[PDB]
Subunit: 138 residues, 8 copies
């Protein structure tokens, strides 16, 4: 049987919350996501739709959900909607969204690598519990 890490991640999340706090762990998770973004990378794309397809394939390779990218031309900003985020335990704000900084760092690396190449990710916090909305503005 393939090992299951859900209970281990729940206990680790509770222990990290009780130990360091709710602000250092965000930076730690962002760094973890940035490091994860180095192992798997998308090919260089020229249009938003191709980038969306490649990122969806990369996410389906590991099964962490689906992504939707939109380009707001009012200020040339990027809106990213992530669906079916994995749920571990009941920690985070709101409860169940504990792996959001990981997505922030991962998407920042993936988009800045190619779209454009000078942006910063800021999480925007009736959407479902597992839906994460982020903005990519210069």
């Amino acid at each position: 049987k393939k090992p299951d890490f859900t209970l281990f991640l729940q206990t680790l999340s509770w222990e990290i919350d009780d130990q360091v706090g709710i602000e250092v762990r965000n930076e730690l998770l962002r760094e973890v996501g940035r490091g994860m973004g180095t192992r798997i990378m998308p090919p260089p794309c020229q249009t938003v739709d191709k980038l969306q397809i490649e990122l969806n394939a990369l996410l389906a390779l590991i099964g962490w959900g689906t992504v939707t990218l939109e380009l707001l031309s009012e200020d040339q900003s990027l809106r990213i909607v992530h669906e079916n985020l994995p749920q571990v335990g009941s920690a985070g704000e709101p409860s169940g969204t504990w792996l959001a900084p990981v997505l922030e760092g991962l998407y920042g690396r993936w988009v800045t690598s190619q779209a454009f190449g000078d942006y910063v990710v800021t999480r925007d916090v009736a959407v479902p519990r597992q839906t994460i909305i982020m903005y990519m503005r210069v």
Copy 2:
């Protein structure tokens, strides 16, 4: 598709190794294992064989390997052999054995709860890479 946490655990292990060190993370993993031992517990058993069967069933519930308990009557000690440890990344001493303190804390809780009830676990470090030997002496 069920989410896969292997790459996330590898990156997290590397980051934790680079940040805190190789001694604080051992205590953190021991605390994580002790907390994990509270969520699932075996029923109170009277003999070593029944304890072995119950612990094997509990391990197979999550798929973290197999266990073998044997009692040394020379000093009434307990020897625990764990097989098929999950492997994440290449961190630990030796490489690949990163989740050993978790097993130490888990087995300590499981055995001390019931055999006897006053023991301490100390890791004993041509056995395979994924085989861990621990001792339970008063």
Copy 3:
């Protein structure tokens, strides 16, 4: 192949119904559920939403369905709705709901352990066949 226990449970349910009756088996199933509640426990939670999120994870660990907790503030009561109950045979009132006292005991243990800690479970009998409604009042 993993063993299948459905036919065995159907035959056992029929035999137990034919032997002891329809009132002793309810107490037996309640005791079985109370004993099951000792093997797996949820972490201590402070709010109803966190309790729901944890109980859903424990239920999904074994695949026995889904739970929904709600609080009536009129008399500070708790309403629990369980969905996708396992079906074995055609025994019970109504037919197919044979494992309801098990849920009663399990939920009583899980909630009383932490919400509050002084409550009793009483089954409330156009809802589907596999949906069970229970009340937790002092």
Copy 4:
């Protein structure tokens, strides 16, 4: 996810052991196996090898192990060896063999229905833990 009944069967076995005893439950399990033998039946066979093949197919239909029949011509007896019995908990004599009377009743029904048709089952208790040997004598 398909429901898992392993923990439920372990708790039920412990409760039944603590409630009635270790002799009434044997008769209950024999009756359960006899009732189980009525739901699934093998076709009428004329030779021992065909009976073995049909019983192996029937067992593989549910995944309860493998069977081997051999005829002792000294007293026209039948020896049955069952392998890979399902293991639930740590109850029974020896530990892990809790569903042996079920096999006794099931095999008695299956063979007596057709080989011959006048025999009784008596369990014969360095074989493995999950191997059960039974004898069919008139």
Copy 5:
């Protein structure tokens, strides 16, 4: 890998259609279904709902679809609706319904064995392609 018999059944159906005809094969399939009804039987039930619940479990044991029984009290008839029939090839009237006499014989045996015990099955031929309606009148 578990063997696949779909192509073999398609070729066999074509050959049987080309050899004997479209009337002898119906009797052959009815006899095959009647023989199949002996290997697996439902427990004796007293009401229509319990019979439906037991037959649904029996069908799900092999995965041949779902059944729905309803009693017309005008002439004390029984109407059976079968859904999700297996499809092999493109033979039968209409195309794809090649295993209908098997269901006729199987349901006749299953119902007549217990509801009542004196009935005959006659196939009633905007329903989907895989839906079969049968009547059970004395």
Copy 6:
């Protein structure tokens, strides 16, 4: 759930054995195998090793065991060894080998299509029960 045809094939084999005999069904199975050989074909190969590699891929596409081809240069004959033949029921000579004429026709078509192109298959009857040996001589 994918439908299971094992019990249906067992009942059909028994009925066909009881109805026509043990010689007409062999011709029927040979014709069925010859028709099956038309749906799936191997690419034209020049050497025996390439033919073996292709035939193994086609067999694994449906999971009907494995094949091994040898060329005896004493009289330019071909020896074919088939392993892991599917087992249905207990019919055939010997018991358990009911789909051997299907293999005869299938291999005849597959080899004669390309090796050479003028041969006839004749079954050669301490090898296991599911191993079939055939010869391909002009």
Copy 7:
């Protein structure tokens, strides 16, 4: 674990696009599909519905989607709608439809082999991304 060829196909598609162009690869894919159509063929059918059923069974054998055939009697043309095309990378016009000439050649071979036997396939380019419409006119 069964090998995964998705990333290999993505890289191969990108390299082929960068090397030969966007017109030679179409002929290459058409030839590949025509060669694929030789390995697996449907049985000769007389009506459109039977052809549709057989082609759907053949497609489900490999899992490449679903097909729908409909005959325009105005000019005796055939319209083919293919659903759930496999997606590899982000190449093709539109992005994601890289295996369309393969379907063109495959369907041309399959239909022309039997409906009628003199037709040519021409791709017709608010339908979804993975839906392909083709026409079969003389």
Copy 8:
């Protein structure tokens, strides 16, 4: 059902062999492997054992086999043994080893990126059919 690309790869391999030759396709496959090595990369390692563990994890992520690295200190060379190569068709020298240049380029990229960083891969052609031996010398 997840799409299967085995038949497509076999037909594509045959067509590429028939069109360009047996020398241009080697360069094409090497370029494909080099491009594949960019999508997934191992973390920078300092010792051979850690590199072996990381490469094995990366290979198991896609299921393309296992790797074994060993350093000859006579001339500081590196020997790489790959096991369980995927098999498509019967093309290549020897038959079945069609994807060897892909592994050559992939391993060259993976090792040269970090061990050392100045090496070239040259394939060394009673080992099994799917085992490939490569050398990494400056």
